[PDB]
Write an enzyme that holds these catalytic residues in place. Structure first.
Site, PDB file in Angstrom:
ATOM      1  N   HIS A 292      33.268  18.848  22.392  1.00  0.00           N
ATOM      2  CA  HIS A 292      32.231  18.230  21.572  1.00  0.00           C
ATOM      3  C   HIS A 292      32.807  17.494  20.382  1.00  0.00           C
ATOM      4  CE1 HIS A 292      32.373  21.050  18.198  1.00  0.00           C
ATOM      5  NE2 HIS A 292      32.367  22.052  19.058  1.00  0.00           N
TER       6      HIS A 292
ATOM      7  N   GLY B 135      33.806  23.470  11.249  1.00  0.00           N
ATOM      8  CA  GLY B 135      35.193  23.057  11.381  1.00  0.00           C
ATOM      9  C   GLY B 135      36.150  24.091  11.948  1.00  0.00           C
TER      10      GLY B 135
ATOM     11  N   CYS C 251      36.022  25.154  14.952  1.00  0.00           N
ATOM     12  CA  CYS C 251      36.061  24.948  16.396  1.00  0.00           C
ATOM     13  C   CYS C 251      37.456  24.578  16.889  1.00  0.00           C
ATOM     14  CB  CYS C 251      35.059  23.850  16.793  1.00  0.00           C
ATOM     15  SG  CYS C 251      33.378  24.502  16.792  1.00  0.00           S
TER      16      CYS C 251
HETATM   17  C1  LIG Z   1      32.404  24.248  15.321  1.00  0.00           C
HETATM   18  N1  LIG Z   1      33.113  23.852  14.354  1.00  0.00           N
HETATM   19  C2  LIG Z   1      31.211  25.217  15.036  1.00  0.00           C
HETATM   20  C3  LIG Z   1      30.400  25.194  13.772  1.00  0.00           C
HETATM   21  C4  LIG Z   1      29.969  26.580  13.179  1.00  0.00           C
HETATM   22  C5  LIG Z   1      29.084  26.372  12.113  1.00  0.00           C
HETATM   23  C6  LIG Z   1      28.581  27.444  11.397  1.00  0.00           C
HETATM   24  C7  LIG Z   1      28.974  28.720  11.744  1.00  0.00           C
HETATM   25  N2  LIG Z   1      29.807  28.934  12.750  1.00  0.00           N
HETATM   26  C8  LIG Z   1      30.325  27.943  13.485  1.00  0.00           C
HETATM   27  O1  LIG Z   1      31.054  28.336  14.346  1.00  0.00           O
HETATM   28  N3  LIG Z   1      30.205  24.898  16.083  1.00  0.00           N
HETATM   29  C9  LIG Z   1      29.109  23.866  16.088  1.00  0.00           C
HETATM   30  O2  LIG Z   1      28.787  23.131  15.179  1.00  0.00           O
HETATM   31  C10 LIG Z   1      28.347  23.814  17.422  1.00  0.00           C
HETATM   32  C11 LIG Z   1      28.413  22.419  18.095  1.00  0.00           C
HETATM   33  C12 LIG Z   1      28.854  22.505  19.600  1.00  0.00           C
HETATM   34  C13 LIG Z   1      27.681  22.543  20.575  1.00  0.00           C
HETATM   35  C14 LIG Z   1      28.556  23.786  20.406  1.00  0.00           C
HETATM   36  N4  LIG Z   1      26.960  24.132  17.217  1.00  0.00           N
HETATM   37  C15 LIG Z   1      26.610  25.464  16.763  1.00  0.00           C
HETATM   38  O3  LIG Z   1      27.427  26.335  16.633  1.00  0.00           O
HETATM   39  C16 LIG Z   1      25.106  25.694  16.614  1.00  0.00           C
HETATM   40  C17 LIG Z   1      24.098  24.725  16.747  1.00  0.00           C
HETATM   41  C18 LIG Z   1      22.862  25.439  16.585  1.00  0.00           C
HETATM   42  C19 LIG Z   1      21.487  25.078  16.584  1.00  0.00           C
HETATM   43  C20 LIG Z   1      20.533  26.087  16.388  1.00  0.00           C
HETATM   44  F1  LIG Z   1      19.216  25.765  16.402  1.00  0.00           F
HETATM   45  C21 LIG Z   1      20.892  27.430  16.191  1.00  0.00           C
HETATM   46  C22 LIG Z   1      22.239  27.780  16.182  1.00  0.00           C
HETATM   47  F2  LIG Z   1      22.671  29.081  16.004  1.00  0.00           F
HETATM   48  C23 LIG Z   1      23.215  26.760  16.378  1.00  0.00           C
HETATM   49  N5  LIG Z   1      24.572  26.877  16.407  1.00  0.00           N
END
Ligand SMILES: *C(=N)[C@@H](CC1=CCC=NC1=O)NC(=O)[C@H](CC1CC1)NC(=O)c1cc2cc(F)cc(F)c2[nH]1
Ligand SMILES: *C(=N)[C@@H](CC1=CCC=NC1=O)NC(=O)[C@H](CC1CC1)NC(=O)c1cc2cc(F)cc(F)c2[nH]1
Lengths: 306, 305
Positions: free
Chosen positions: A41, A143, A145
């Site tokens: 992603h 970040g 990821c």
């Molecule tokens: C990657 N860097 C990581 C971001 C992250 C943010 C906050 C806390 N822990 C984390 O690991 N992952 C992402 O931003 C992903 C994007 C890729 C599709 C997988 N998205 C999420 O982790 C995410 C999106 C989302 C929407 C929602 F309505 C509820 C959620 F829990 C949720 N999580």
């Protein structure tokens, strides 16, 4: 003596972390030989995440839309491919620090070390268990990821996890290094439900043995029980069922401590029916299920790694 | 989101662990530039430990009675010296992996990472706090001596602890890298009593704030207290008294969360007077005091090295 959540030494993994930038997105990747591994992603923008068509999205990308950085070294990307949820950028320089490695898909109940990274720079290391419901309870910010989880056996790094996303409950989900998620999750910006969780019964018993090894014994009963009636007590409390395969794994710990698996199960029973009375086991007021039998032994017998 | 006991990445320290052997004894040492640092009791035999005269005992040793090994590389020893409880073996090859480093004596209440080692080989890493009574709660077996604790600033490893011994209670004691023990302990095969412990009040508050950052809020009250009265409640419960300097250090966490230090003290009062009702905070049924305010911020803002 003493018993801690202990991560593996993270040196061999540190030399493999780079930062991958596509467009506006930047996350971490794993540099092994002449291939960099990162979550697919990274090719999505802010909107794309709602429901991305990755094949279509990657078709619009070319090799030079990818900036891979190992510290300040700029690796040129010379080929790109998408394996499941993982993007593979073929680069021109083979990472000189590449350790002896495997890719491994771990089973629920198993444990591994996570090297949390930001912008390709390691930030910290800790130990996690793959829950029965295929999530992990870690510490990841935006970040993180592309941070990876791993086990070290003597000289060989076994990579088993790459971080992709956080769930509404605040637990974490990701893939093996081949890009297939653990659990039912998909990489889109959506709220997704992991299963009901269960307590890893075998790990809880290995920790009670660790406790006995380390002088804590207030919970040891005289009573005994049966594998059949204990499981009736397990299910009432959300513990994964204890199988005879589990008894035999727990065997050397049951043996070292002189305490039969069945007898320990009965002590566990009372702990489950009776709480802990405001007491503690190995410094916790809860039953710990994130230590495998093997982790207890490696810690309680001093295993090192070359 | 999420909040774990997190160690620093141990890479820079791994390239510094060697194995030191004197006679029958082998433990770990720390190789920086042309000097290897290790616990002085590597000089002692099985019986010497009861009450060693270290000066006399080291006078009987010469350079070649020391075998220092970095993997298979055999460093030769060209000079030996005793600094407090630490032996310094000057070798001929400067460790090429020597990172930017400092030696630091940490205050009680502060935290650090431990790279547990056996035979000069890293085995595992975990985070620890220097208790108010100058012990640590770790995981050390026979032969873990010379394992070191450290902090990483960005490029710079700050070494603050070298392991020497385990106490009867099952906690651990050691020295700074200059060889001065933390606490009242001495390096002899004796049973030694650490003080009464206390709970690091400032860390407990920082962890409650970490809790609020991560969505746990069941303990937040509307009641408030005063710094004076809370301390009468801290003392009845064995909590290190809270000072005004503590309030100010907790300041940016109290600020990020919009919750006055004073108000949080009141919620802590009730947690202490009332227990946790079988509930949990950040996945524990106990109040956690092994996170500094800085650890909370580093983790909750993603600092890298
Ligand atoms: C990657 N860097 C990581 C971001 C992250 C943010 C906050 C806390 N822990 C984390 O690991 N992952 C992402 O931003 C992903 C994007 C890729 C599709 C997988 N998205 C999420 O982790 C995410 C999106 C989302 C929407 C929602 F309505 C509820 C959620 F829990 C949720 N999580
Ligand atoms: C060094 N490798 C380490 C050994 C150790 C063994 C078991 C658990 N944890 C450990 O850290 N330290 C020692 O062997 C020291 C020797 C140097 C004088 C300091 N000794 C002890 O740690 C020790 C001796 C002793 C006697 C006693 F009556 C009660 C104790 F708790 C005790 N501890």
């Amino acid at each position: 003596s003493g018993f801690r959540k202990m991560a593996f030494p993270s040196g061999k993994v540190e030399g493999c972390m780079v930062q991958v930038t596509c467009g506006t997105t930047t996350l971490n990747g794993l540099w092994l030989d002449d291939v960099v591994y990162c979550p697919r992603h990274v090719i999505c923008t802010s909107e794309d995440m709602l429901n991305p068509n990755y094949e279509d999205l990657l078709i619009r990308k070319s090799n030079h839309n990818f900036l891979v950085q190992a510290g300040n070294v700029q690796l040129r990307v010379i080929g790109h491919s998408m394996q499941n949820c993982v993007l593979k950028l073929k680069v021109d320089t083979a990472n000189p620090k590449t350790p002896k490695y495997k890719f491994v898909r771990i089973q629920p109940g198993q444990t591994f070390s996570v090297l949390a990274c930001y912008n390709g720079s390691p930030s910290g290391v800790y130990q996690c268990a793959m829950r029965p419901n295929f999530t992990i309870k870690g510490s990841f910010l935006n970040g993180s990821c592309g941070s990876v989880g791993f086990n070290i056996d003597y000289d060989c790094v076994s990579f088993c996890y790459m971080h992709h996303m956080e769930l509404p409950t605040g637990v974490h989900a990701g893939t093996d290094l081949e890009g297939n998620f653990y659990g039912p999750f998909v990489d889109r910006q959506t709220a997704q439900a992991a299963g009901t969780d269960t307590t890893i019964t075998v790990n809880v018993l290995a920790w009670l043995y660790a406790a006995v090894i380390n002088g804590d014994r207030w919970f040891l009963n005289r009573f005994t029980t049966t594998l059949n009636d204990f499981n009736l007590v397990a299910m009432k409390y959300n513990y994964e069922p204890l199988t005879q395969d589990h008894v035999d794994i727990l065997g050397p710990l049951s043996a070292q401590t002189g305490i039969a698996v069945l007898d320990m199960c009965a002590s566990l029973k009372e702990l489950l029916q009776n709480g802990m009375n405001g007491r503690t086991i190995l410094g916790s007021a809860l039953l710990e299920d994130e230590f495998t039998p093997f982790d207890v032994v490696r810690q309680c017998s001093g295993v090192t790694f070359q």
